[PDB]
């Protein structure tokens, strides 16, 4: 209807235009007749009649004569709702400053006038005068003149002198101000001499003057002359039961403003002393300030209840304002709630709805049906029929409900599966029956939880619920590809018990004809559910283009597996059910069914699995008793032995042989070992049993114990819970985080005594508090993540880009913890996947890698692919479907319009509550060295001559399996190009002192070495050797301080030995605190040690890693490639200069001397190398290394937090957030564009700006990408309606008003506030068509 919203400042003429009349009296209503007063806050003349079509007096009280203004009253005869739309105005006697434009942090008034805020405040409060265009009389504009100074200046000046006080002075200043001429003057200033901040401040001044000139506002509009009055019905005075009333706080504030204004107007007629009028004007300013914003400049005015009054500003901001409490979430019609029960008889797509709730929610539909079918004549008859609950009413209700989805929702909606659409089934009672398989999606248990039910109304809403939100459409998690409809705890136990063989059961050794005979035998009592038999099984294979060829063969199975085979669909093999079928086997089975067959067979299969599991779990009759918790028979011996060892340690400490800090650890280790022994003994005794037999001999088998069965199948429990039940409760902690030495040696089968229970309580209280805190934090993280990345939408099919990420498996030193299949499945290749033999292309390009392609890649053993990624997408304002991948919840390539930002935010935030030397090879392969320079030492072996050496174990198949990091100068047993066996330590080194080593051998002379200037005399008394320890710069004398210890290599012939392969002299400038051991003239072998130089986690790690915080001590990277050099020393921090090979060297950094540098001044380093060592910074990687390196550092550094806790989410969702982090570009060269040199612009704008410009006959502009946090990157929103929702409302509206900003609703958070279709999903087509017609 409008398609855009504009905001600006209001002129007094505009304010008089809005109003329908002036409010002159502070009266509200008569205390006797309760009628609106005349010219008061509630006035019928100004704001409209109080009841529909009726004058106040009553002479005109019918619709027939509407639109007429009664002469007696003046009240127009119209609808009363018009009182909700009409404003008034109050003409202030004297101008008042607007608090938003005075006490804002930038202080718009002061910024525009170029005056300190304190000067403005003191002139406002009638403290000192101000000269306004004084003239040529030796006065300076905007000069403070206190009362005495003003008085003595007035003398000797017959001129007016133009001095004023109060807000009138400010208004005169603003009105006299000229913006174009001052902008010209500032341009002249910027043209001339420039200083560090002079140029910046002048540029800011000119830019903001230009902005204010272009906004269309005028400065003097910041000073109020007329005050608008809100319509009465938004600040109502409403009668409550009895003689009492309730009123809004705005009535009090308006009454105060009007009282003081009228008093001032009266006072200005009496010609009162200036003291009185000054005080009155100060009070008027204070009252208007309190009205517009109460509690911002001074003390908040309070009411009778002694609480601060709510002002106009308080009604907009906060979590209880119109922007948040009512515009983004509000109460809804056609809704209900109730407690949820099980209902295990249901199908996956339907729920159970009480008849009473269904009758109440669908009332209009039932009225329509009753009238249509002729049962009722009018709607009143239908109402009475439904109110009496006749017989026909229930048939009509059953007809209405037939195919009408209802949305069920549970209160903590953490992801999109917390709302799902089901088909109702009318039931008796008052509880909602919820299908078991969906509980995990809701995180719902049946111990008192409640659910809300909403009913879609429109045809479009019903179709969306049926096609998008149905429960049979969401069976895969959207965070990863895994199903979320897995059977949970009792289905698992039933299917485990059914498929679980026994050694010598009834009917063992039989040969059945198929599943039917197996079931017929079991059900008639002739065979046991686990009796090993031979069964003829017929299974189908898709060994063709979908043909399902059959194969019949005699399998060796049990009766349970043969029975369970009856429910498995055609395409699957028989080996899926031919096992014990724990918790994870069932999930694998469902995943296999989904990938091979499709969606419908999977849903049918899941329902059959649930039914069979429940039936046979009931059949088994599995229970829990006190004899199932078998305590080990050796527990007392183990505890006694631990007691003896700890007592011996204590008495040894009492003899002063060990420090307490070590005996504590010894006792802790003793008790840990004892606990491990007890747990091992318990589990050994509890997981096996002896049975007999086919012939009569003792034979072991896995136990049928009930606790063990529950833990082993994954139904419920673990080894820790069993350990506490039958082992020992373990080792408790303390409030300080310490671990109390003596553990709880009792389990729960045995009782705890009072002290052990006291310690347990210590633990439990902390557990509860930590749970609460985690739930608190994980919501804030999700809210920020949604705010930053809400408006991302797939808005293209292919951008055509040829770039992407390089996906390879993740290896933490030893084993691999994420194969290539997990990281590559479902993505789009950016380049041909050449065969590892380099023969031909294996996967051409732009091919969505589904399961078959992943299997092919695994078969050919490729370990590196190039996959298109979101962070390297060429689409402007959105993403393309090919650079994203596939949906992960539907299984196909993502659809256009899908909102991927909200999905990414929800997927990242949903699991938040859950989360809290020598090198030895391990496999028979071949050593491969990457990024290392080799050389042969004196011993003849190979020594590393590099800092970034990487060792890989390339097996006979050419696949990496072990990646290891080796420091500098390590002796290697083997090298590249030689096969090795297992268990061979191919590298070793000393992890102590310093790795400073030489490179050649020969006579060493102390060149440029003077005793008493750089070294100290410290002879090795123990060995008798003389060692020259190099002191520091401070201690040493200045005679040779600038000199450094250089040890040149020479021969016996008197010549000079230089670095082999080059003419560079071989000198080693050793640093301070270096212990020179070998004397001059003593030949050294290659690599000799010249000097023995001495020396978070959980959610907060993720939250501080999306905020791009800089660590405490960031490792210094190589800013530029070139020879490293040094400059002036000890100028607060050690100075280092890098000189490129040819390029200029304007780089110099004050590197602190505290950092232990790992590079010598004679060693060149390229950019991106580490100078110091420590945690890396996120900003430095982006600058030194491309975008693909900072994203790789993040998607791997936050995925480590989740992997530890077992949470798995796709990498798609972390690259969506990163794409929104590095979104602003900083320009370095303007080029032929229209961009300022030092400016930050949206990277999308600059990318397209120079793109079209380059195509023409111009040259594009360079830039440097920038990285922000999710909280700083969400403040760059270009709409002031979405920004005010989650930012400071006062700041956003104050800056948008002066700038004359207008925003066209283009986001998801703005069309919700306005109340129109979002541009993301089903509303994507509507918005595109609107833009097309609008362009025309």
Residue 37, burial from CB neighbour count under 10 angstroms (0-12, 13-18, 19+): middle
The answer to whether 621 contacts another protein (rule: CB under 8 A) is yes
Of 414 and 537, the one with the shorter C-beta distance to Mg ion is: 414
Q: Does 300 bind another protein (CB under 8 A)?
A: no
User: Residue 70 touches which of Mg ion, Zn ion, another protein, none (CB < 5 to 8 A by kind)?
Assistant: Zn ion
State the binding string over 614-653 for Zn ion (x if CB under 5 A, else -).
----------------------------------------
Paired with 54 in beta bridges are none
Cβ nearer to Mg ion, comparing 4 with 772? 772
Among 37, 121, 858, 1149, binds another protein (CB under 8 A): 121
Candidate ranges 367-375, 794-802, 1085-1093, 1138-1146; the one touching Zn ion (CB under 5 A): 794-802
List the one residue out of 184, 189, 167, 70 whose CA is nearest residue 121.
167
> Distance between CA atoms of 513 and 1026, rounded to whole angstroms?
94
70 binds Zn ion (CB under 5 A): yes
Stretch that binds another protein, among 454-462, 871-879, 967-975, 1135-1143 (CB under 8 A): 454-462
Backbone angles phi, psi at 935, to 5 degrees: -160, 160
Name the closest residue to Zn ion (Cβ): 73
253 makes contact, choosing from Zn ion, Mg ion, another protein, none, with CB < 5 to 8 Å by partner type, with none
Q: Tokens representing 754?
A: 């009072």
- What is the sign of the dihedral through the CA atoms of 706, 712, 713 and 714? positive
The three-class DSSP label of residue 351 is strand
The option from Mg ion, another protein, Zn ion, none interacting with 14 (CB < 5 to 8 A, set by class) reads another protein
- CB closer to another protein out of 450 and 693: 450
- C-alpha to C-alpha distance for 1069 and 1073, rounded to whole angstroms: 12
Residues 786, 787, 789, 792, CA torsion sign:
positive
Distance CA 689, CA 841 (A): 56
Annotated binding residue 57: yes
Q: In the window 1118-1177, what residues touch another protein (CB under 8 A)? A: none
Q: How far apart are CA 1275 and CA 1268, in angstroms?
A: 11
DSSP state of 1177: P
CA atoms within 13 A on the CB side of 88: 26
- State the sign of the Cα–Cα–Cα–Cα dihedral 253, 255, 256, 262: positive
**What tokens were used for 326?**
């009512």
**CB of 999 within 8 A of CB of 987?**
no
**CA-to-CA separations, 942 to 447, 970, 1235, in angstroms, rounded:** 68, 8, 56
Is 900 a residue that touches Zn ion (CB under 5 A)? no
Site for another protein (CB under 8 A): how many residues? 194
The verdict on 451 binding Mg ion (CB under 5 A) reads no
Nearest distance from C-beta of residue 51 to Zn ion, angstroms? 13
The residue from 132, 559, 681, 873 that contacts Zn ion (CB under 5 A) is 873
Please report whether residue 799 would count as binding Zn ion according to CB under 5 A.
Answer: yes
Token representation of residue 132: 């306004």
The answer to whether 1068 touches 1009, Cβ cutoff 8 Å, is no
Residues 447, 695, 1142, 1234: which binds Mg ion (CB under 5 A)?
Answer: 447
Stretches 35-43, 227-235, 387-395, 761-769: which one binds another protein (CB under 8 A)?
Answer: 227-235
User: Rounded CA gap, 1084 and 13, in Å?
Assistant: 95
Interface pick for another protein out of 142, 185, 203, 473 (rule CB under 8 A): 473
What backbone torsions phi and psi does residue 31 show, to the nearest 5 degrees? Answer: -75, -10
* Near another protein by CB under 8 A: residue from 23, 70, 258, 707: 707
Residues numbered 22 to 41 that lie near another protein (CB under 8 A) are 34
Largest pairwise CA distance in the chain: 133
* Residue 70 counted as an annotated binding residue: yes
Whichever of 44 and 475 has its CB closer to another protein, that residue is 475
445 binds Mg ion (CB under 5 A): yes
Interacting residues of 544 by C-beta distance below 8 A, sequence separation 6+: none
Q: 43: which strand partners?
A: 37
Q: Does 339 bind Mg ion (CB under 5 A)?
A: no
Q: Print the binding letters for residues 1313-1332 with another protein: x by CB under 8 A, - otherwise.
A: xxxxxx-xxxxxxx------
Q: Which residue has the tokens 């248990």?
A: 445
351 is in an annotated binding site: no
Tokens describing residue 1244: 């999308």
Q: Which is nearer to another protein, 336 or 969 (CB)?
A: 336
Please check if 502 is assigned to a binding site.
no
Residue bearing tokens 């799902």: 420
Decide if 5 contacts 1305 (C-beta within 8 A): yes
Kindly state whether residue 870 participates in binding Zn ion, applying the rule CB under 5 A: no
392 binds another protein (CB under 8 A): no
Q: How many CA atoms lie within 13 A of 383 on its CB side?
A: 3
Q: Both tokens of residue 833?
A: 């996947």
DSSP codes of every residue in 274-316: HHHHHHHHHHHHHHHHHHHSTTSSS---B-TTSSBPP-TGGGT
The reply on whether position 55 binds Zn ion by CB under 5 A is yes
CB of 1214 to another protein, least distance (A): 17
Backbone φ/ψ region at 730: left (φ over 0), alpha (ψ -120 to 50), beta: left
Nearest CA among 1192, 1174, 1156 for reference residue 1117: 1174
The residues in 876-895 that bind Zn ion, with binding defined as CB under 5 A, are 880, 883
- What is the CB neighbour count within 10 angstroms for residue 650? 14
Tell whether 593 is in a known binding site.
no
**Residue 799 among known ligand-binding residues:** yes
Asked if 288 and 228 count as a contact pair (C-beta separation under 8 A), the reply is no
* Residue 73 interacts with Zn ion (CB under 5 A): yes or no: yes
> Candidates 888-896, 1009-1017, 1054-1062, 1070-1078 — which segment interacts with another protein by CB under 8 A?
888-896
Binding of another protein by 80 (CB under 8 A): no
Q: How are beta strands 810-811 and 971-972 bridged, if at all?
A: unpaired
The token pair that represents 636 in the structure block: 């007392």
Shortest distance, position 1283 Cβ to another protein, whole Å: 14
Would you count residue 57 as binding Zn ion (CB under 5 A)?
yes
Answer for which of 214, 413, 861, 1205 binds another protein (CB under 8 A) is 413
Q: How far is the CB of 446 from Mg ion (least distance, A)?
A: 8
Residues 647-686 that bind Mg ion (CB under 5 A): none
Binding mask 1262-1301 for another protein (x = CB under 8 A): -------------------------------x---x----
Least spacing, CB of residue 903 vs Zn ion, in Å: 18
Q: Please list every residue from 197 through 226 that binds another protein, using CB under 8 A.
A: 221-222, 224
Closest listed residue to residue 1045, CA positions, set 1001, 1090, 1085: 1090
* Contact flag: residue 5 with Zn ion (CB under 5 A): no
Q: Is 732 in the site for another protein (CB under 8 A)?
A: no
253 lies in the binding site for another protein (CB under 8 A): no
**898 near another protein (CB under 8 A):** yes
Instruction: Please choose, out of 27-35, 793-801, 811-819, 976-984, the segment that lies near Zn ion by the rule CB under 5 A.
Output: 793-801
Contact (CB, 8 A) for 582 and 492: yes
Which residue in the block uniquely carries the two structure tokens 């649930």?
610
Does 439 carry a binding-site annotation?
Answer: no
Peptide bond connecting 693 to the previous residue in cis, omega within 30 degrees of 0 = yes
Among 251, 472, 578, 998, binds another protein (CB under 8 A): 472
Quote the least distance from Cβ 774 to Mg ion, whole Å: 17
Locate 232 and state its tokens: 């009465």
Rule CB under 5 A: which residues touch Zn ion?
Answer: 55, 57, 70, 72-73, 799, 873, 875, 880, 883
Residues of the binding site: 55, 57, 70, 73, 445, 447, 449, 799, 873, 880, 883
Feature table: binding site for Zn(2+): 55, 57, 70, 73, 799, 873, 880, 883
Give the residue numbers of the binding site for Mg(2+): 445, 447, 449
Binding site for Mg ion (CB under 5 A): 445, 447, 449
């Amino acid at each position: 209807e409008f398609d855009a919203i504009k905001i600006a400042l209001a002129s007094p003429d505009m304010i008089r235009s809005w109003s329908f009349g002036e409010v002159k009296k502070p009266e509200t209503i008569n205390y006797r007749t309760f009628k609106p007063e005349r010219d008061g806050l509630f006035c019928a003349r100004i704001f409209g009649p109080v009841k529909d079509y009726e004058c106040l007096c009553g002479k005109y009280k019918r619709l027939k004569h509407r639109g007429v203004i009664c002469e007696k009253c003046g009240v127009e005869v119209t609808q009363t709702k018009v009182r909700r739309e009409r404003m008034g105005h109050i003409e202030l006697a004297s101008p008042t400053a607007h608090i938003w434009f005075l006490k804002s942090l930038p202080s718009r008034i002061g910024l525009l006038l170029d005056m300190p805020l304190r000067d403005i405040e003191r002139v406002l409060y009638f403290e000192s005068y101000v000269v306004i265009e004084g003239g040529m009389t030796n006065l300076e504009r905007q000069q403070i003149l206190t009362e005495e100074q003003y008085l003595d200046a007035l003398e000797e000046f017959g001129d007016e002198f133009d001095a004023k006080m109060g807000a009138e002075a400010i208004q005169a200043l603003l009105k006299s101000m000229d913006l174009e001429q001052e902008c010209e003057q500032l341009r002249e200033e910027l043209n001339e001499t420039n200083s560090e901040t002079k140029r910046k401040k002048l540029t800011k001044r000119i830019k903001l003057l230009e902005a204010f000139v272009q906004s269309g506002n005028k400065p003097e509009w910041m000073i109020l002359t007329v005050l608008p009055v809100l319509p009465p019905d938004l600040r109502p005075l409403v009668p409550l039961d009895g003689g009492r009333f309730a009123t809004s706080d705005l009535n009090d504030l308006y009454r105060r403003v009007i009282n003081r204004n009228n008093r001032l107007k009266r006072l200005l007629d009496l010609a009162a002393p200036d003291i009185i009028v000054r005080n009155e004007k100060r009070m008027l300013q204070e009252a208007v300030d309190a009205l517009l914003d109460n509690g911002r400049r001074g003390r908040a005015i309070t009411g009778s209840n002694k609480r601060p009054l709510k002002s106009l500003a308080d009604m907009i901001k906060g979590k209880q304002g119109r922007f948040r409490q009512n515009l983004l979430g509000k109460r809804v019609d056609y809704s209900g709630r109730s407690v949820i029960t099980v209902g295990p008889y249901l199908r996956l797509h339907q729920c159970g709805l009480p008849k009473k709730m269904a009758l109440e929610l669908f009332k209009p539909f039932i009225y329509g049906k009753l009238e249509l079918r002729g049962l009722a004549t009018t709607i009143k008859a239908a109402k009475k029929m439904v109110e009496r609950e006749e017989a026909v009413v229930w048939d009509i209700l059953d007809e209405v409900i037939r195919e009408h989805p209802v949305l069920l929702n549970r209160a903590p909606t953490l992801h999109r599966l917390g709302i799902q659409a089901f088909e109702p089934v009318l039931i008796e009672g008052k509880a909602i029956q919820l299908h078991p398989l969906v509980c995990a999606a809701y995180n719902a248990d049946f111990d008192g939880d409640q659910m809300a039910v909403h009913v879609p109304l429109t045809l479009e809403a019903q179709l969306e619920a049926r096609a998008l939100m149905m429960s049979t459409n969401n069976i895969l998690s959207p965070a990863n590809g895994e199903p979320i409809i897995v059977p949970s705890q009792d289905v698992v136990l039933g299917l485990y018990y059914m498929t679980r063989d026994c050694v010598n059961a009834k009917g063992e050794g039989m040969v059945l004809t198929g599943p039917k005979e197996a079931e017929r035998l079991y059900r008639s009592g002739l065979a046991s559910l686990h009796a090993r038999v031979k069964v003829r099984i017929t299974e189908y294979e898709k060994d063709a283009n979908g043909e399902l060829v059959a194969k019949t063969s005699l399998k060796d199975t049990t009766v349970g597996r043969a029975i369970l085979w009856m429910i498995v669909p055609k395409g699957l093999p028989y080996s899926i059910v031919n096992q014990a079928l724990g918790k994870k086997a069932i999930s694998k089975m469902l995943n296999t069914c989904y990938r091979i067959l499709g969606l419908k067979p999977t849903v049918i299969f899941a329902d059959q699995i649930m039914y069979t599991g429940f039936a046979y779990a009931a059949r088994s009759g599995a229970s829990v008793g006190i004899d199932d918790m078998v305590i080990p028979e050796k527990k007392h011996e183990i505890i006694s032995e631990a007691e003896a060892e700890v007592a011996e340690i204590q008495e040894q400490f009492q003899s002063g042989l060990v420090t307490a800090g070590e005996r504590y650890n010894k006792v802790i280790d003793i008790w840990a070992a004892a606990n491990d022994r007890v747990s091992k003994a318990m589990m050994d005794n509890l997981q096996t049993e002896t049975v007999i037999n086919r012939d009569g001999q003792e034979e072991k088998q896995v136990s049928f114990n009930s606790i063990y069965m529950m833990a082993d199948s994954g139904a419920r429990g673990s080894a820790a819970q069993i350990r506490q039940l039958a082992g020992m409760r373990g080792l408790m902690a303390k409030p300080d985080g310490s671990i109390i030495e003596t553990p709880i040696t009792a389990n729960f089968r045995e009782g705890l005594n009072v002290l052990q229970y006291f310690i347990s309580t210590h633990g439990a209280r902390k557990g509860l508090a930590d749970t609460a805190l985690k739930t608190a934090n994980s919501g804030y993280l999700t809210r920020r993540l949604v705010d930053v990345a809400q408006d991302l939408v797939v808005t293209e099919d292919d951008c055509g880009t040829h770039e992407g990420i390089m996906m390879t498996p993740v290896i933490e030193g030893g084993d691999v913890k994420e194969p290539l299949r997990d990281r590559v499945l479902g993505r789009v290749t950016a380049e041909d996947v050449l065969k590892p033999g380099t023969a031909d292309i294996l996967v051409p390009r732009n091919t969505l890698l589904h399961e078959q392609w992943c299997d092919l890649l695994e078969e050919n053993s490729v370990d590196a692919v190039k996959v298109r990624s979101v962070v390297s997408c060429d689409t402007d304002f959105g993403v393309c479907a090919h650079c994203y991948g596939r949906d992960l919840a539907r299984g196909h390539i993502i659809n256009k319009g899908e909102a991927i930002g909200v999905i990414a935010a929800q997927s990242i935030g949903e699991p938040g509550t859950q989360l809290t030397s020598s090198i030895q090879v391990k496999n028979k392969g071949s050593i491969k060295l990457s990024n290392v320079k080799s050389v042969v030492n004196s011993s003849g072996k190979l020594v590393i001559t590099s800092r970034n050496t990487e060792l890989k174990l390339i097996d006979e198949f050419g696949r990496t399996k072990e990646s290891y990091k080796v420091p500098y100068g390590a002796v290697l047993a083997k090298g590249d190009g030689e096969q090795v066996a297992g268990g061979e330590t191919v590298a070793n080194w000393d992890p102590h002192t310093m790795p400073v080593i030489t490179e050649v051998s020969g006579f060493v002379r102390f060149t440029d070495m003077i005793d008493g200037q750089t070294i100290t005399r410290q002879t090795d008394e123990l060995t008798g050797l003389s060692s020259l320890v190099v002191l520091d710069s401070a201690e040493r004398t200045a005679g040779g301080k600038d000199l450094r210890p250089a040890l040149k290599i020479v021969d016996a012939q008197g010549n000079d030995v230089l670095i082999p392969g080059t003419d560079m002299p071989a000198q080693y400038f050793l640093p301070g605190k270096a212990i020179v051991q070998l004397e001059d003239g003593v030949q050294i072998s290659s690599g000799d040690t010249l000097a023995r130089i001495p020396q978070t986690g959980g959610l907060p790690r993720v939250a501080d890693l999306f905020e791009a915080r800089r660590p405490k001590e960031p490792a210094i990277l190589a800013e530029i490639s070139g020879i490293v050099s040094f400059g002036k020393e000890t100028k607060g921090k050690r100075r280092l200069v890098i000189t490129p090979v040819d390029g200029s060297d304007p780089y110099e950094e004050m590197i602190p001397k505290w950092r232990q540098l790992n590079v010598f001044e004679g060693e060149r380093v390229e950019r991106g190398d580490v100078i110091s060592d420590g945690p890396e910074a996120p900003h430095d990687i982006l600058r030194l290394r491309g975008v693909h390196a900072v994203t790789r550092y993040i998607v791997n550094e936050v995925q480590d937090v989740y992997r530890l806790q077992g949470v798995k989410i796709n990498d798609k969702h972390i690259e969506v957030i990163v794409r929104q982090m590095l979104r602003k570009a900083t320009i370095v060269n303007a080029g032929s564009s229209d961009f300022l040199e030092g400016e930050q612009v949206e990277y999308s704008r600059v990318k397209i700006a120079n793109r079209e410009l380059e195509a023409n006959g111009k040259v594009g502009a360079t830039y440097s990408r920038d990285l922000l946090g999710i909280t700083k990157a969400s403040l760059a929103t270009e709409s002031f309606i979405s920004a005010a929702s989650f930012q400071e409302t006062t700041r956003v509206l104050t800056e948008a008003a002066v700038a004359g900003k207008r925003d066209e609703l283009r986001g998801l958070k703005e069309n919700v506030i306005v109340g129109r279709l979002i541009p993301a999903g089903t509303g994507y087509a509507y918005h595109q068509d609107r833009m097309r017609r609008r362009a025309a």
